């Protein structure tokens, strides 16, 4: 039973080991927390930080394949394990381009993906007069403020950042595509950010195909292995311009779970793992919510309204197991299937008002 | 949080728990396994067997709501406790009805249920007479035996038996219904018995409406709270008859996880909780197949034929993580999802001599 190793125990990890192992594979997690959500359910758990370039190295060679939940990671151990040999999916090298989001807007230019007008800022104030008001800054590495006056200007985002072009966005797409290391690509629907996804997205066929020919270009520029997650934005001009990269499952990829063949996690395992891919089709149409924690509130978990929100036919819950609630913490998530995808954005919009994560 | 106890830590029990965490419960698991399949995902387990009295004791009275995945546990501890108010569902009633196939019969001819003529055995030699050979023997509790002529009551099935006609079958169905204890019922797509399920039945529509209509009669007669398995019988002179009912999540309804709204599991769990209901319409149809560990292996599984397996559109793995395969355990199962049912067949036929649990 070849093992698999998981950097990193979060819920999206959680997802991934589960997945795994329900196709027949072994799972290490590492993860600095004891008994993590995906350690919890794994067959091993490495208790170690992100950066203990030492543990990070045992769950590599520990393992068949290694792959990771989430970017703030230890790169650099990573490109040297991957190498002399070790696989790592997706690469270590392709999550290097993706942490610099300067780096990462500079790769897609030249590989001609459409992206949005940007500058590296050297001389901030000199910059900005490239673009005028309003424009938005950035952070280079793990955030984005949008300048829109003086005195934002005066008290800009520190450190190393960079410019870009404020867009006139029409709607905020994403797409999930993954792809095998033998070079199979297996592409999802483009869904719609109404946080709320909508599968698939109300747009002109003609868009929906350049967003999938698009995403599937980064992907193949990047030679990814894995399943990636790729935000873009619809102009208010007719362009279709990628604004990020996510080297993983996705949360706007959750819909997959309930609305296609295969999910996202089971898309992501047979992608690191060489396996054939399988099959996007979506079945009918979905609405995602995110299940943030309620503001001003902190503690204990309690999550209200369920009775009435589960009346809701095409609704159904996802709530991951967290002992502490957060404000605008994502304690889980729910979706709506509905033939008619505009009933199951009416329907999750209602059930969005009366679902809640409180504390107490 | 509300707390569910779960009496079985088998691969039931286990996709039982994760879909009722997944609802934002907390879950206790019973069974005399040391991290047994469900206890590993659950949040606590109790060590102790189906009949340690005291011990399910302990768990039903430290739980909200107590539900099983087998039969063959204390029902008369579990009467008690249901006699003093404790939630058990289904009923250790409902449970007690069914554990006995005669008084099951009698329970259904009760209640009008169509089923085979039968008749407890008070002097088998006698009574089979009356009923002409050939006749179907089977054991009250503990399998089935055909009565062909004289020869074979030497033979016979020793202790309480019943006897019943013989069926002339042309097709065995099986449809799972859930109930809450409100009255809300949910009725599934009726299924084919190919072990190998075939979802929907290819049998004309007239057939599947009665199918439906006599599932629902049964667990509105025991007025049962969660979902039942309802095997069928549809003879070769056009008639539904009811052979068996299983009180629990049923092997014959894992289809319901890959080509329906809401899975059997989640249904449970919804019914249990006396929540609403979730959809039960059908996707797409589906083609179920079991896995069973190969004759002359022992040991760590191992399988054997994923990558040509996976090659085949539509097909999804469902390995149980079992510490050890034997000949016929059941190891899993895989699923072949397609819009042409025909089609789903040939594929999981095809695969079913591809995919192979052995020992590592
Ligand atoms: N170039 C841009 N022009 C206008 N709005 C933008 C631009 N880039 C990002 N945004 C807005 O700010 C939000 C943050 O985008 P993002 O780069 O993904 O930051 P984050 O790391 O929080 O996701 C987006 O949802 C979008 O609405
Ligand atoms: N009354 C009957 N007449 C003819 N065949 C029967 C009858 N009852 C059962 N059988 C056959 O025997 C098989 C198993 O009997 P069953 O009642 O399901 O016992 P069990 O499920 O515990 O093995 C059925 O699948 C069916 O093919």
């Excluded at 989001?101 to 949005?116: A, M, R, T």
Aim: proline residues 4%.
């Amino acid at each position: 039973m070849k093992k698999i190793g998981i950097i990193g125990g979060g819920q999206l990890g959680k997802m991934m080991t589960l997945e795994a192992k329900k196709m027949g594979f072994y799972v290490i997690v590492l993860d600095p927390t004891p008994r993590s959500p995906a350690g919890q359910v794994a067959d091993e758990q490495i208790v170690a930080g992100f950066f203990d370039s030492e543990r990070i190295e045992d769950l590599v060679k520990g393992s068949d394949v290694t792959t990771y939940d989430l970017e703030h990671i230890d790169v650099q151990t990573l490109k040297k394990l991957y190498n002399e040999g070790y696989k790592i999916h997706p690469s270590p090298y392709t999550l290097e381009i993706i942490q610099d989001k300067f780096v990462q807007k500079e790769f897609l230019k030249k590989n001609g993906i459409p992206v949005p007008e940007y500058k590296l800022v050297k001389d901030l104030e000199s910059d900005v007069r490239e673009f005028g008001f309003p424009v938005v800054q950035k952070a280079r590495k793990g955030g984005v403020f949008i300048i829109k006056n003086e005195k934002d200007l005066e008290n800009a985002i520190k450190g190393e950042t960079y410019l870009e072009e404020f867009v006139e966005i029409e709607k905020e797409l994403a797409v999930m595509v993954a792809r095998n290391e033998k070079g199979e690509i297996a592409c999802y629907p483009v869904v719609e950010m109404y946080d709320t996804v909508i599968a698939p997205a109300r747009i002109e066929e003609k868009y929906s195909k350049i967003a999938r020919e698009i995403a599937t270009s980064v992907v193949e520029a990047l030679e990814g292995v894995g399943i990636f997650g790729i935000e873009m934005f619809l102009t208010k001009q007719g362009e279709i311009l990628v604004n990020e990269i996510a080297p993983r499952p996705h949360n706007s990829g959750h819909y997959t779970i309930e609305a296609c063949v295969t999910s996202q996690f089971e898309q992501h395992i047979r992608a690191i793992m060489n396996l054939p891919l399988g099959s996007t089709e979506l079945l009918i149409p979905a609405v995602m919510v995110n299940l943030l924690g309620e503001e001003g509130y902190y503690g204990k978990p309690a999550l209200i309204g369920l009775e009435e929100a589960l009346a809701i036919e095409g609704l159904s819950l996802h709530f991951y197991g967290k002992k502490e609630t957060r404000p605008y913490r994502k304690m889980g998530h729910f979706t709506v299937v509905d033939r008619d995808v505009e009933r199951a954005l009416e329907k999750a919009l209602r059930a969005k008002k009366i679902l809640k994560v409180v504390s107490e």
